[model samples]
Target chain A: GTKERILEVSKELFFEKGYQGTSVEEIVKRANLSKGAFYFHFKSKEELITEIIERTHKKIISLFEENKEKTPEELLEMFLEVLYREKKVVYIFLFDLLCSEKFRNIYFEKIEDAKRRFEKFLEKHFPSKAEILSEIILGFLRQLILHYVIKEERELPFLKEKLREGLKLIF
Target chain B: GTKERILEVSKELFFEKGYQGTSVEEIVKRANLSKGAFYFHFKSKEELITEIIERTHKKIISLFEENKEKTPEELLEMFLEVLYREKKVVYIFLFDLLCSEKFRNIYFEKIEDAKRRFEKFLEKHFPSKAEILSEIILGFLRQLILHYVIKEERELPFLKEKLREGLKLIF
Candidate 1:
């Protein structure tokens, strides 16, 4: 009971305050719980964030599973679209998550898994440049996030055009 | 003399190991200097990095000064070319620089300096899109560094081609 309550309240704070900006004290107060209860549920702040990413990871994994056969262009576009749809949770939550080394490291496993998937996707269509192209897609998506998704800038047409044009040259 | 030596040694390590990964002790050892000597030249390790950025910043600023009359395409191409050429220092330097709150704050002044200059550059050609274009250049540079420069992969033609193509849509 307290576990879910604590997690819910903590997620709200983490969503807004970032990893470093939000203090343990703040989370406990909002959850109407004590520090003991917080740690009782999670070993450390890093652990709590790992669990949060894990939850999102599962959802995204399923998305990828369902849409496994889509073209890289359409698939990546849909990917950014989900990011656009979840921009708030991402900007507030991941904006902070990415800025911290500790939080970013937690996502490495998931990121690695995604990279492997991308490698296979590119290999399935374009063989010679699979690895390099994978890195390009990963990098391009990140750039779009930095430009469009974060700090309240959104240009759906620009994102679609850029991505479509970008892939056209290679594939 | 010692100040210059410390900075030179610091940049070498910083270029390879990154700002956070390189220790002051390591820098001192590599430079064959003592802690007292290093402290005498710089206030702190952070101060040393500030000075390194300052030194490189001058070289870059001068590059811009010398190439003032290039076309927008030529100018931005050269801009990314430098990044493609010097991705090593950047991957290690900015890879860490953008992650830390303190280092990023320290970079704010230099970044602002660059942005102001870029705004003027774009405004000279297309005034309406100057600000957005500036952010695009910044984001693209960051992404290129992530993809091509950090690792052993370098697609010189691919990077050059991609840069020109992306800008054509907007310009």
Candidate 2:
């Protein structure tokens, strides 16, 4: 549980301040652990970040799995709702990770996997142009989240409604 | 000439390594200047970065001016072309700047101004929803370059043709 406790504290620090902005010393202090203990669990700050990303990916995947049987319309709404609920933390984690080429490779691999899973789900139901539909839905959700983060604007209702209407066209 | 040389060297270094990855010492060394000489030209690294962004904006504006009389299709093509040409350097510079809240404030102000100028230009020739048109054209070009930089895949031709077709749908 030491590793889990460290990650929980790191998740908070990394989100409040970015990866570059947060330091190992700060993480150790916040986690109430020594530098040696922190290093014992994670090799470097980069390693800690990798752990956080992996855990976040697992969390999102599990959330989707829980709602797998929902309609496409409801599925999207639920996805956005989950994202919006953790908007601050998720956005910060993503913003820092997405900006770095090293981190992007790992993060996008998980995203591609998630997209493929969704694509298979869509194919089972709609059975047409699953790839393009996947890209559009994924891209829309991403850009919508980005719009919210960058502009600090709330347009989820409009976006959810648009997605509902747009799915009809795509399907 | 000295100032121009400083900007050139600084831009190259900033592109190769990010703002934090670069330092005043490295820039001065590459420019073959003393500390005082660099300080004489730029008060700080932030000032130098701001200058580089301003110069890049001027370069882009001049590009727009050169193609002022062209159709929207031609204009969009030229814009996308320039973005593709400078994809690596621009992406590195812009992404690093945007991700940093400290830099984003200054950078976004300049970006907003540039966007306004661009919106005004598009408004003159194309009578349509300015916000939506601007978003589509700018967003598509952004995504195209992002794909090239992030994915190392060249989708410019496909994107260019798609933009042409998409514009027809819009106009």
Candidate 3:
């Protein structure tokens, strides 16, 4: 229970502030753990940061699983709504971690993994121009991150419709 | 002319590396300016970064003036091609500077400025769906930045056609 508490508070601080911007002192203070208990739960801040990233990924994995029957466009529609509502993936996975090169390799791999599945979905549906559609869909997501940061709102139903239009716009 | 030389050489460095990534020593080394000569032109690295950013914006201004007749889509095609050609404004002004929060306000200023113009442009072309159409086009240009960094190549012509297709994807 205390471990989960540490994870929760640390994730909150890290989300608001970049990794270096947050320190163990702040995490310990916010999590209500002594230095001993904090170190006892995790070896170092690096380990904890990695955990938060992996933890965020797991939070997203279920979204994918729940929406497995849906088209990638619908999946993104559902996913982005949750992201806007919760802001966990945007704050933790996309913004704080994404801003740093150290954490980008992990995010880059995740992007590649997600992009491939997304591409495969379009390929199944469009059967042609699958390559360009899949690659460029990410532009939408990356742009989504920009809006998330700039405090600009994205309308999911509207954006999803565009994604669904897919190949028709191209050919 | 020394000041001009400092500006030119530093622009070269900041483009290849980032604002903070470039050093006074290296910049001076490349420009053949002594430490005194460097600070003589720009008071500090922060000032130098701000100066480089300003200089980069002028290059962008020149492009707009030259391509006044081209649509934004064609302008992106031409601009990105120039980026691919000489590796300026896009890499230096857009990408490298975009990586640091210290300089984000500058990029935000540009994004805010661009989004307004874009909204007005679509509002002129499409009377009914201007808001949603203008809203999503940023996704395209913003996504272009991702391709620039992830070193993923973009098919500008393909993306341009979709822009012309407008919110046909919606209804």
Candidate 4:
């Protein structure tokens, strides 16, 4: 629980100030933990960021699993809900983690894993073109997240509708 | 001629090293201009970035104008071609310019202007939903540019086909 508390606080601070902008001092201060205690839990800030990203991806995967049996439309809607619900935090995480060469490899690895899982779920329905369909779906989701981050608006419904329509073109 | 030379050199260095990573000394060093010579043309690095972004916008706008009378398919093909042809320079210009908060206002103004121009151009063909259509087109283009930059591959035919198919869905 203590380690979880530190992770929670660090995630919030990292999202707010970014990885470079946020410091260990700030994380320790906010979490009310000593520097030693924080270091005991996580070796470094980069390690902490990696942990946070892993946790975020796990949460998303769990959510996907919960809705895996649902229709594609239903799955897309639930995904958008989770996306916009934590839009700011996710955006910061993506920008800081995906844009850096240091973390990009790890980030893409996680993404590829998620894509594989998604592809498995989609394959039964799209037997022949599952890979292409998955790519297009992932592309739409990626663009949707970016639009929310940059536009600073909750346009998930519109996006969901558009995705539904766009998928018809492919599927 | 000196100002243009400085801008050209700065563009290359900034694209290669990023804004904060690249220093004024390095910029002047490559431009072969002394500190006094650099300061004579621009007040600061920020000012130089502003000028570079403005010049880039002008160049892209001119390209757009040159192909204004073409069909949507042809226009998009030309757009992809030009962007791909100048991929390195354009990517560098955009990455550095957008990465700086100091230049965002100026950069976004030019982006808005481009959006307006595209909106006007598409309105005649797709009158009712030109604004949304414009956003979708520009969004796809910008996202494709990002893909090219990150992947360092210029798949123009693939992009052209995607754009063609995407526009058909929107219109």
Best by DockQ: 3
Per-prediction count of colliding residue pairs? 0, 0, 0, 0
Give lDDT tens digits, candidate 3, residues A1-171. Answer: 877898888877876776788999999988777999988989999888788667656656777767777866677667666655556546666555555667767767676766666666666677655655554555655565565444454566654555445423333
Better of 1 and 3 by DockQ: 3
The sequence of per-residue lDDT tens digits that candidate 4 reaches over residues A70-162 is: 977677677777767766657655657665657767766776787788788888786655654555566666655655455346667776776
Top-TM-score structure, candidate number: 4
Stretches of model 2 off by over 4 angstroms after superposition: A1-7, A20-48, A62-75, A114-140, A150-171, B33-41, B62-74, B114-130, B153-171
Candidate-wise lDDT, in order: 0.68, 0.71, 0.64, 0.71
Docking class of 3: acceptable
Residue pairs whose backbone atoms clash in candidate 1 = none
Candidate 4 chain A worst ten-residue window by lDDT: A162-171
RMSD (Cα, Å) for all candidates, in order, is 6.0, 4.6, 4.6, 3.4
Least accurate stretch of 10 residues (summed lDDT) in model 1 chain B?
A: B143-152
* Model 1 agreement with the true structure over A1-171: per-residue lDDT tens digits: 987787667668876667677887898998878899999989888787667666666766766777779988778877777766656555544455544555655444565677787787778777866765665566567666754555337677876776666555435
lDDT of 4 at A150: 54
Arranged by DockQ, best first: 3, 4, 1, 2
Chain A TM-score compared with the true chain A, each model in order: 0.75, 0.83, 0.77, 0.86
Per-model TM values vs. the true structure: 0.63, 0.72, 0.77, 0.82
* Residue B57, candidate 4: C-alpha displacement in angstroms: 1.6
Q: iRMS for all predictions?
A: 6.2, 4.7, 5.2, 4.4
Tell me the lDDT of candidate 1: 0.68
